[PDB]
Design a protein around this ligand. Sequence first.
Ligand code: G2P
Ligand code: G2P
Ligand code: GTP
Ligand code: ATP
Lengths: 325, 427, 426, 426
Amino acid sequence: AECNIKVMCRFRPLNESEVNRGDKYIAKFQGEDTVVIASKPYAFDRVFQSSTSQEQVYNDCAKKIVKDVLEGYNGTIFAYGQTSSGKTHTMEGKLHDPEGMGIIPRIVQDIFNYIYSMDENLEFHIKVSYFEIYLDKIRDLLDVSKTNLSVHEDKNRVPYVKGCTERFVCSPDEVMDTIDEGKSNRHVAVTNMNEHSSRSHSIFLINVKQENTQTEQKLSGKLYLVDLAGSAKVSKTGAEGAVLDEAKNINKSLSALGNVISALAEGSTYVPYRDSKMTRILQDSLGGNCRTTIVICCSPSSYNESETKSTLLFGQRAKTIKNTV
Amino acid sequence: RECISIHVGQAGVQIGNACWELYCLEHGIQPDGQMDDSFNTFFSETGAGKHVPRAVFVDLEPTVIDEVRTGTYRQLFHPEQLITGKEDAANNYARGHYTIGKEIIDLVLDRIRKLADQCTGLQGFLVFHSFGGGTGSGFTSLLMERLSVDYGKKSKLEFSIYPAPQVSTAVVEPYNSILTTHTTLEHSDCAFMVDNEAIYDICRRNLDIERPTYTNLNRLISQIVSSITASLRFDGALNVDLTEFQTNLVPYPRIHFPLATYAPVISAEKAYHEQLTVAEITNACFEPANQMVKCDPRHGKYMACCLLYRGDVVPKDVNAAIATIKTKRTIQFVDWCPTGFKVGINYQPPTVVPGGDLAKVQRAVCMLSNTTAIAEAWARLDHKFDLMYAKRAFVHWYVGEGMEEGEFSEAREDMAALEKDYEEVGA
Amino acid sequence: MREIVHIQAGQCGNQIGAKFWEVISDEHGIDPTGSYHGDSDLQLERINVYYNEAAGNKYVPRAILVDLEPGTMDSVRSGPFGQIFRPDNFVFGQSGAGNNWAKGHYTEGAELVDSVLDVVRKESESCDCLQGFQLTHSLGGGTGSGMGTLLISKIREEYPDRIMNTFSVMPSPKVSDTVVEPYNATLSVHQLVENTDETYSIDNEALYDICFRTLKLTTPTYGDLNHLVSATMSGVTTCLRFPGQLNADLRKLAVNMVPFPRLHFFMPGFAPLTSRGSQQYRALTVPELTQQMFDSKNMMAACDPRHGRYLTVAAIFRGRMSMKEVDEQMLNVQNKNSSYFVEWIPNNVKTAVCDIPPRGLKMSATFIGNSTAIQELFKRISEQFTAMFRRKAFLHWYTGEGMDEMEFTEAESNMNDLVSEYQQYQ
Amino acid sequence: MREIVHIQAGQCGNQIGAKFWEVISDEHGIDPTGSYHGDSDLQLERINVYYNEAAGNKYVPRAILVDLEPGTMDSVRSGPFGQIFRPDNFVFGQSGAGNNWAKGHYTEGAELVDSVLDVVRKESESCDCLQGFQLTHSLGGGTGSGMGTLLISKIREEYPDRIMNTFSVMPSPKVSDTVVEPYNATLSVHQLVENTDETYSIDNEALYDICFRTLKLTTPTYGDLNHLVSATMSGVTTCLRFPGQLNADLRKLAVNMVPFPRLHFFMPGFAPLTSRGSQQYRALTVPELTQQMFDSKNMMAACDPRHGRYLTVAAIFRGRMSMKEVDEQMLNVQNKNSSYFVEWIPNNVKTAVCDIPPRGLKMSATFIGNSTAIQELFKRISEQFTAMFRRKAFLHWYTGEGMDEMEFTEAESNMNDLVSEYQQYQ
Ligand SMILES: Nc1nc2c(ncn2[C@@H]2O[C@H](COP(=O)(O)CP(=O)(O)OP(=O)(O)O)[C@@H](O)[C@H]2O)c(=O)[nH]1
Ligand SMILES: Nc1nc2c(ncn2[C@@H]2O[C@H](COP(=O)(O)CP(=O)(O)OP(=O)(O)O)[C@@H](O)[C@H]2O)c(=O)[nH]1
Ligand SMILES: Nc1nc2c(ncn2[C@@H]2O[C@H](COP(=O)(O)OP(=O)(O)OP(=O)(O)O)[C@@H](O)[C@H]2O)c(=O)[nH]1
Ligand SMILES: Nc1ncnc2c1ncn2[C@@H]1O[C@H](COP(=O)(O)OP(=O)(O)OP(=O)(O)O)[C@@H](O)[C@H]1O
């Protein structure tokens, strides 16, 4: 009936831009649940170390959600963190490598692998969609003609996306082809802090509807796999020109997420999901029937101490939130 | 010896047009731009029988530059020095810094660079602005950081207008004040402050102006800022340089926030009935109600003080005056600096504006006092900020500019560290 | 410098917009023909912020009058100042909306929006630097609510960085001259809350209440009501039109008055508002007009502010005055009414002043108010919308233009979101 | 400085209040239009204590005229000085009380008191420092006794620290122009004794007796009676309007004249009161007018003071005079009438003097008297109240507005408490 939003932290190794500057490794781990930064605790469910590989993260965090989303409930996996925190490497990664592949290929592989183990009477109809935010407009990457989509409500007043490129898929390899088309059309800019700086909050939706021929029971599940951008410090990154305009929109999304997640932690009356459109599509995740699992990303460098501490308290105030499942 | 003075924002240029009229009247410079070594530190020699100030009035909104161009001081100021922007700051620290700030700083930073090449005796800098809004917070803070990396060693005298506890003009002022002070704490060698409600108290009980305006407020500001540089313009018995305000007032490189107050302030009919000697002005400048900033010095302790006089002021009597201030146990100096006095004398008397509210006097004093009394003011400014920060009030504008919740917390903990130092030094 | 592109949609929007150009033309000293005859040089200094230089020292206004009927333009063009507007800006259709939000938003507006978007584009490119858009429309009817809201969304995507000013009159239960007013009101606010960064919520019955009690006019017509709301439009745009001791641009008002992005529905006001016979028996000083501004009578909305609390209020003063009296008066109004101001903000009263007052008055001030009492006007529109929607009353005309009932339910959910948001900060 | 807010309730209160503003306007030298034309500078020095500065050197009075009928204001507004008052202060209902205390206190006043309390609030906040309230009402009728007493209780809770002046005329058995006068009188004094700190008990028959014997006028109308009672109002407020050798504020009179909180019902007077033909045959010196002040004829109440004893009396002199003659005259009046002064107080005669006498007279003085003889007027009202109440006569009209007979019994108990209190100190 009620389940807490599970939060997990993932630190990474030092990148090339950090070791040459001489940044000190501040991450100090005390077991799996507790992490200490500058002699103060931060309690979570599972804290991943820098040596944790790609497959080890998926087995611990998003393994059980494949069973929960197919049982009849909804599920959402989205990450929070600043630039160079390791978000795109976690979700997207590199698809052509079996070891370096992230969560969203592993999610698709486990869904199709579980369907092959089920009996023939369970008929599945998977249909995918993929879009991002750019210049304050919902742009679909599977079709470059349309640049703005509207967010409409369903019969139960739950918001969802209308007009998205809804591709019906049969095999898992076709889903990997669309993910290749998704990353190719993604507007990724360059900056001083991250060469592959994704300047958009990319949303991957899989509306997994199923129906058994024997029992004649229909079930549906909305599986949002979001890859959010990060609040880039203009003094550190040097966002000038058109990328400065991108900093406005991406920071509005996470600052709006900061409002609703703090409103839910304190337990306000209104819970302003209508602050931004990114909060609307994430409305079911934080206050719907979804088994949400936030995965906060942080860097261990001393150059980013202030923003990393803000990411941990972002997770601690997420720990006290419960969904209406 | 020379110096340049820039102005930023509505508060800066309204001080600039109000103070430069006083500077041109002292040296006999007519408003049309013309009439030896006294006016050299502020005004240059423009060929033959003509002068120009070494100043630049910069503001993002064009409401204030056009009236100075079409005012009465059209020929005095250089027309190219009057820089005007394109878009308003809108009381946003982020908007006047990054969006509108980045496209205009390249003009003014290179302008003051070549404006220093013709100069040779540049002692330092003094700026005029206000952190109560956007232009004086965003564009000023970007100017200070980009000037400190270029020059660095030269001094910078900040004159900001802070808000009162209850009286105010804006509503989102502590966000602009707390964000810009994170950068101003390390780049400023010294920073004098003024309040908006205290200066009304100066003209109410003493000058008896029941209906004052910002024109009257800036005229006594001109007396303050012109008195600190009066030693450089004219000879005196004990001259003090502009760099004296760095050594004799800053005990530590991050504690550089002194107060300000000035005396005598007296109307016309009261000037002839009141006696004017060094005793009462020395008793009046330490008076807590006669201060330019709302802080009770009785609660705190003075770290350093400097007295600079003007006019016919002999040295034997002023040394007796400060001796009476030390034995007075109403105020109390800190044990870390028993010799907390710096005396200065100048023969040139205080001038008056034609038709001005202030009366003529044979002598005056300008009291800049370093103390820990601003700690309770900062804690009150931080206290009101915590109520709005908890509800995320007025946050969607700043994050819409490009910033985020990071520097909000960095400004908070940095202000907390400022409070931690003022309570440690006051022990 | 900071040009503002004016736009007039709907019958009432063209009327109040026509009065807006009339009242400011007297402030700047412009003849009805278009020539300058002002007495001061400051009137001509910031004349380009609305007008454009033309041959013979003529000044044309940037007013784009749009309406789905032709007869409305004939009354505006045949007015006293109707001859100053540009003939190219008079773009209009033939078939009216007939008080239908769906017609002006899907069928009648879609065929006309392609023509008017070319008119605002050339006007916005000819300016030196665009500041914002000043809209005049009405939530009642079809052309004001349907087409007037639609063009803002096209302007929003085209100019996302520029502000959007909307002076939007809205109905009331006591004065209701339209049967299908709550449907047009409930659907319009769904589009206004996402697009417009600024919205002046004006009520008609308050303007009737203002003219009856404080003005006590014998025969108030619609033209007298336009004089009140037109003065508020001229008062907000005073700082970027004349010099002042504390200037506040329209963006500066937005940063101070919009604490959250959805809380941009304010309660405007204007003062002094005195009768012809009660002028000699009144002093023009600043403290007496200040308490009139914060009074429930002077405000141009039916919501009593004492039923709620002010989020943040702005008072744009005008005329030569004492700054101490302005700074001390804003203190005492919030001190002795601390229950009616939020405790989680230390100072809620924004202020500004100008040197050039209106013609015929020595001192004046305009009140803009953000308060939780405005939700009372939304819920009465909501229960009127819910009362007619729960049995699908008067919906079949909307469905003829391809509109679905889900959008009515979505507008109802947004209407529930508005009243709950203002209740959070109360 | 020490502003006094004037208030006029009821028909008689508006008439005597209208004469009060007329007689003092001549002392200060104010035209009927509102402009100043006085000869001395001291007239303008303390003009702000009642009036307010306005444009064109105009001075508006702070007179809040309240009445439950509209025709009363038409006679006051159409008077000689009716054009000086503010139109906003003229607040009034439509349905009269019809000489019923219950209507003006529960139904007709309750709907109007919310409107008038907003008028006195803005006038009290605009002043520099509020001193007190000067009320003019009548115990007869419904609008004077019912509504006029009710507004004081609302002002009492709002301003508990400020004094309350009430010049209240009350009926008499010999001159009775109302059938339901004792019910209105008995109910009103119950509210006056707890709220008002000051009460000038004036009787109508004494004003008829004063005009008949000492003045011997041929045809005294109501306007001539108003001239007597209006002069006493101007006499008490002389010290805070002009300089004087011994100033006595209205609060200074209260501390001297109110020995106990309930004993604040006094017997006013005025002198010199001479005919036109008997002016040449009289000296204006101080000893001859002093004995006229302590005479039973000059006092404006029907109670003969020789039937009781003075608690404490005040004589506010006016004009240039010898202080020794004032100090020696106050001694001999109490010496040779020691039986008529209480032995448990060593000196009962308060005194004050001013330098600027009234216009047309060189010297004058006003008598205020606290004595035990005032209880005679209360018991005759009591036995009239008890005579009609013991068989429930004329009560069913009062019960229609929700009033109970217990409040009549409570007012009867307070009436018994008043007469017993003055008998204690006799
Ligand atoms: N204060 C004013 N209010 C007006 C005026 N004219 C109309 N209205 C009010 O606004 C309400 C609706 O506004 P409109 O008259 O513009 C209806 P609209 O033209 O938008 O649609 P259609 O005429 O059907 O094409 C209307 O019912 C009035 O209450 C006016 O001149 N002044
Ligand atoms: N000395 C004066 N006495 C007056 C005057 N007018 C009335 N009165 C006396 O006061 C008595 C009652 O006072 P009012 O006339 O004011 C009756 P009121 O207006 O309060 O009630 P309603 O008229 O029934 O609404 C009345 O019976 C007279 O004896 C006057 O002008 N001068
Ligand atoms: N003492 C004093 N203060 C002033 C004067 N002029 C402006 N100020 C202060 O300046 C503050 C506003 O700061 P600014 O950033 O300059 O405001 P602005 O220039 O209008 O900026 P925008 O609103 O964004 O256009 C106000 O709160 C005033 O208290 C002045 O002449 N004297
Ligand atoms: N756990 C990890 N181990 C090793 N390398 C990592 C890890 N996480 C991230 N990286 C490195 O980071 C790079 C990718 O950076 P990434 O795109 O994640 O930046 P980002 O923070 O997502 O940018 P944005 O905030 O714009 O989305 C890869 O080249 C990868 O080598």
